[PDB]
Amino acid sequence: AGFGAQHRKMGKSLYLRNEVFAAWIEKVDALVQDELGYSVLELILDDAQDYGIETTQVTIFAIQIALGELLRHHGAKPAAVIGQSLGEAASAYFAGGLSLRDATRAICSRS
């Protein structure tokens, strides 16, 4: 729970029962595991309450990247169908052309 509890429920159920969504969740989880120590996939699956600002932002970030890329897999520009619902980082990735790498290390900080 906390902020993005629904993002975590939806993200877990989608990770289990959708291979594209799961592929993107893994793709982001490796990147955060490179930029940080922990793993976002652990946090999503282990549906624990999260009041930490950074880890919540990272969870919502990965969930939105995977949902947006799942929509893109069905042939729609993600910023055109859920652009208003994106966080600063996911929107920076889908609308600002920011690389997933720079986005991941942008939400981590730590500075």
Residue numbers in the entry: 717 to 827
From the paper:
Recently, powerful evidence has verified that Pks13 is an essential enzyme in the mycolic acid biosynthesis pathway, and Pks13 has been extensively studied as a drug target for TB. The type-1 polyketide synthase enzyme Pks13 consists of five domains. The overall Pks13 topological structure has the order ACP-KS-AT-ACP-TE. The meromycoloyl chain on the N-ACP domain is transferred to the KS domain, and the intermediate product α-alkyl β-ketothioester is produced by a Claisen-type condensation reaction with another substrate, the carboxyacyl-CoA loaded by the AT domain.
We have determined the 2.59 Å high-resolution crystal structure of a partial AT domain from the M. tuberculosis Pks13 protein. Then, the crystals were solved, and the N-terminal sequence was identified by mass spectrometry, the results of which were in line with the phase presented by the Se-Met crystal dataset. These results indicated that the crystallized protein was actually proteolyzed to become a fragment (Ala717 to Arg826). The overall structure of the core motif contains a long α helix, five short α helixes and two short η turns, in the order of α1-α2-α3-α4-η1-η2-α5-α6, which constitutes a compact motif. The crystallized core motif ranging from Leu717 to Arg826 represents approximately one-third of the AT domain, and the overall crystal structure displays a fold similar to the reported AT domain. Although sequence alignment showed 100% identity between the core motif and the AT domain, the secondary structure elements presented a slight conformational change from residues Ala796 to Ser801, for which refinement indicated two η turns instead of the β strand highlighted by red dashed square line. In our work, the topographic conformation of Ala796 to Ser801 was transformed into two relatively disordered η turns, along with the conformational change of the position of Ser801 dislocating from the substrate. Furthermore, the side chain of the binding site Arg826 was also stretched to the reverse side of α5 and lost its interaction with Gln773. According to a close view of the superimposition, some particular apolar contacts among α1 (His723, Leu730) and the long α4 (Gln773, Ile779, Gln780, and Leu783) and α5 (Ile823) residues all contribute to the stabilization of the unique state. The nucleophilic elbow of α10 and β5 also transformed from an electropositive state to an electronegative state which indicates an unsuitable state to absorb a substrate. In summary, the conformational change of residues from Ala796 to Ser801 and the rearrangement of residues Gln773, Ser801, and Arg826 might all suggest that the degraded fragment formed a unique crystal packing state to survive proteolysis.
